[PDB]
Structures are given as C-alpha cells and as structure tokens.
Amino acid sequence: EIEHLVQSVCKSYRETCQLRLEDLLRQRSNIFSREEVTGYQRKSMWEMWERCAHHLTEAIQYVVEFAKRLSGFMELCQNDQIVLLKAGAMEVVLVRMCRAYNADNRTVFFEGKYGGMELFRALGCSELISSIFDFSHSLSALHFSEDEIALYTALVLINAHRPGLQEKRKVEQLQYNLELAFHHHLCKTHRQSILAKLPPKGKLRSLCSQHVERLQIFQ
Ligand SMILES: CCN1C(=O)C(C)(C)COc2cc(N(CC(F)(F)F)S(=O)(=O)c3ccc(C)c(C)c3)ccc21
Q: NR LBD domain location, by residue?
C-alpha cells in the first residue's frame, strides 16, 4: 500500500518539521532592525559559527526523527541508516529551509525574526550565503505543499547511489516505492511540471560541502 507510504511520509514530516508553516508565515512581518543587524555583524567569526552550528545540529536531529518514523527506514540495517542520514541529513535541512524563506523581500527566518544575507556577514563566506539564498529562492518558487516537500525530502534521504551501503538492494526498493508514490501523487494533482524545476542533485551536494563538515570544533 503505496498510499500508506505517502500517509506516513506526510505524517512524520508534519510531526518532525520543527517550525510550523503557519508561524513562519505569521512571522513574516517581524523583521530585524538595523540595530539587530549590526548586532550580529559585530560578533566574531567564531561566535557566529558556534551559533549557527548549534541550530544546524538541532535541525539535523529533527531530520533523524523524520527518518526514524519513516515506514521502512527502521527496517534497514543499522549501517545503512547511518550512511543515508550522514550523506543526506544536511541536504534535507537545506530543502526544509525554503519554507522559512520569503521571496517577496529575500529574507530568511533566523532566531525569532526575518532578515537578509547581511545578517550573516560574521560567518565570512558571503559567496556561500548568497548561494544558499539563491537556492532557497528557486526552491520557494515551486510553492510546494507540505505533502510535496515531505515526499521530496524523503527521496533526498533515500538514495541507493550513496557511496558505502551494505544492503543496496533494500534501499533501491524503498527509493523505488517513494519515486512511484511521488510521481503518481504529482500526476494525480497535475503538479508533474515541478519535476523539471527541481535542483540538480550535484547542486544540493555542492551546497552541503566542506564548510559544514568538521564542526565539532564549535561544540
Ligand atoms: C553556512 C552554514 N550552513 C550551511 O552551509 C547549510 C548548507 C547547512 C545551509 O545553511 C545553514 C543554515 C543553518 N541554520 C538553521 C538550520 F539548522 F536550519 F540549518 S541557521 O543558523 O538558523 C541559518 C538559517 C539560514 C541561513 C541562511 C543561515 C546561514 C543559517 C546553519 C548553518 C548553515
């Protein structure tokens, strides 16, 4: 029952989203003032990474629970669980970020309120921030429903092509169930057209590269 697979993906996503959609949208009005901006800009490059590293660690814990509730994930062998979360958790965080992005004025939700890329100057990788803003922007352009994003993020996480799986047959099968769930849910509702506008897979991996490995220094 593929429909059960959908229903679970959707339910867990609802349960693990970490920030509800209605509060992200209600909070689009609370925008950081120039003094709050400055305030973040004057932090040290250490402090700012400590800070965002915490948040990224928290968000990662939610994705872990998303898979923990994913029907057929816990079936998988412990090794494969770890490989898939290691290689995909961060990619899913970044896709989940597009909910908290507002394309009307190019701001993101960060620590209670909304602001632009200027907020993150103290990280010192303005190129990378501009890229994270771009990517969210073109992702928000799909106007995904909650159900779409749930199924999407599940495929981001269940990819049998990840270097280092033991039971590569068992993941292909889950990946393949999800593909059919997703493609069929899209076609049933005439949303098929969004498949063309999905980011190319390299783009995600690119974006989730070295700048975010080795963050134990910040713990
Ligand atoms: C630059 C470091 N970094 C990243 O590089 C990825 C690819 C994980 C995406 O952006 C991030 C977001 C976050 N955060 C939250 C979380 F947990 F949802 F990820 S966060 O600190 O709240 C945050 C939100 C939005 C932006 C644009 C940035 C730079 C940070 C932390 C680190 C990163």
A: 1-219
Architecture of the domain spanning 1-219: Orthogonal Bundle (1.10)
Q: Domain boundaries in the chain?
A: 1-219
Let me know the angle formed at the C-alpha of 176 by 172 and 168, rounded to the nearest 5 degrees: 5
Resolution in units of Å: 2.3
Sheet holding 101-102, edge to edge: 101-102, 107-110, 113-115
Nearest by Cα to 149 from 114, 174, 185, 176: 185
- Ligand 1 first shell, C-beta below 6 A: 52, 55-56, 59, 90, 93-94, 97, 108, 110, 120, 123, 128-129, 132, 207-208, 211-212
Q: Which two tokens stand for residue 68?
A: 């923990």
Please tell me the distance from the alpha carbon of residue 148 to that of residue 106, in angstroms, as a whole number.
Answer: 22
Tokens, residue 34: 């120039």
In this structure, are residues 147 and 186 in contact, taking their beta carbons and an 8 Å threshold?
A: no
Distance 57 CA to ligand 1 centre (A): 10
Best probe residue, ligand 1, of 18, 97, 113, 208 (max atoms within 8 Å of C-beta)? 97
Q: What tokens does 14 get? A: 């609802």
Nearest CA to ligand 1 atom 16: 56
